[PDB]
Amino acid sequence: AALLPIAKHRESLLYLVETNPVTIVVGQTGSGKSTQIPQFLEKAGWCADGKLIAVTQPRRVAAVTLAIRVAEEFGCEVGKEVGYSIRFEDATSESTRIKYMTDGLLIREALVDPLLSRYSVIMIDEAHERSISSDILLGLLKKIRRKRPDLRIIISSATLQAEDYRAYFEKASETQEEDSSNDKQKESIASIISIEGRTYPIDILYLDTPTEDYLEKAISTVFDIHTNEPKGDILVFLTGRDEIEQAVQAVSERSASLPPGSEALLPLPLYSGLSAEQQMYVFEEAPENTRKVIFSTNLAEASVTIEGIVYVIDSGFVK
């Protein structure tokens, strides 16, 4: 946990969240923002007054997995110190301080608490995913922050459009223009803090011509990169369930015709409505003299992180 770049800038983000009303953090998923920032604010002592910290997530399985991960890292049980709430599932308690909430459920709790007086800082992680409820939380937190400046707001930005986020925090309102008569300096209500990540160098390869049928060149790319390059788990991002079904059937039929004595290929699908067995098959690592070829839809992006993956083929289409 100490090797994450979020630990090196912990004092800077603590200062910016204690001083500025809103601070926008820029960093990609995997640098430890969502895993350590609630831990950093808890260790700073933002829950000593019985006040809570909340993390507003767009995805549900991602919320559950990050809840159990941070509960394991913190050494605490789920729901008694670090808890979560997804739709019709509220693992929370009075002693719980760190909250991983569905943003839609914080709409439904904004039907309960008007000023959000039960929470100290509200943060929107991976805000460029841009759910509807995240944006309407942004609007209502802007209104409440005009109404109550005591609470704090953190926004996690993937890239430069945080500046546009920054734009959303200079145009506050129009009633303040009547009171804008003094020559005081415009205080930095919104600030930006840099926490980078760490990724290995990745080679990008394109095509000289536009592809004809991305399924057939996807599987032919899979078999060519299996034959040529050394061991590494091949992953492809396809679009929809019938496409992954056709891909796994095609790679199974071609692996039936592969010459013996080489590395075998294990076809694996990744969907949203998977059962426990094949999902665990994807999660468990490749056997001896076997290379996993995993065809995935939009789960391996941010929702569920799979490890030991070297190759990735982009179909260029998302539903």
Partner RNA sequence: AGCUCUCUUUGCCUUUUGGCUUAGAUCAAGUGUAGUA
Contact set with RNA (CB under 7 A)? 58-62, 239-242, 245, 271-273, 297-299, 303-304, 318-319
In the complex, the smallest distance separating the C-beta of residue 137 from RNA, rounded to whole angstroms, is: 15
In the complex, the smallest distance separating the C-beta of residue 99 from RNA, rounded to whole angstroms, is: 17
Residue with tokens 């929470």: 119
In the complex, the smallest distance separating the C-beta of residue 248 from RNA, rounded to whole angstroms, is: 13
Among residues 239, 209, 236, 243, which one has the least CA distance to residue 313?
A: 236
**40 or 214, CB closer to RNA?**
214
Among residues 19, 36, 133, which one has the least CA distance to residue 141?
A: 133
**261 or 273, CB closer to RNA?**
273
In the complex, the smallest distance separating the C-beta of residue 61 from RNA, rounded to whole angstroms, is: 4
**CA pair distance 87, 66, nearest whole angstrom:** 16
Which amino acid is present at 281? Y
* Rg from Cα positions in the chain: 23
In the complex, the smallest distance separating the C-beta of residue 154 from RNA, rounded to whole angstroms, is: 21
**23 or 34, CB closer to RNA?**
34
In the complex, the smallest distance separating the C-beta of residue 145 from RNA, rounded to whole angstroms, is: 26
**110 or 300, CB closer to RNA?**
300
**258 or 300, CB closer to RNA?**
300
**21 or 269, CB closer to RNA?**
269
**38 or 58, CB closer to RNA?**
58
Q: Residue 17 half-sphere exposure, CB side, CA atoms within 13 Å?
A: 26
In the complex, the smallest distance separating the C-beta of residue 264 from RNA, rounded to whole angstroms, is: 27
**CA pair distance 227, 220, nearest whole angstrom:** 11
Residues with Cβ within 8 Å of residue 172, at least 6 apart in sequence = 142, 146, 189
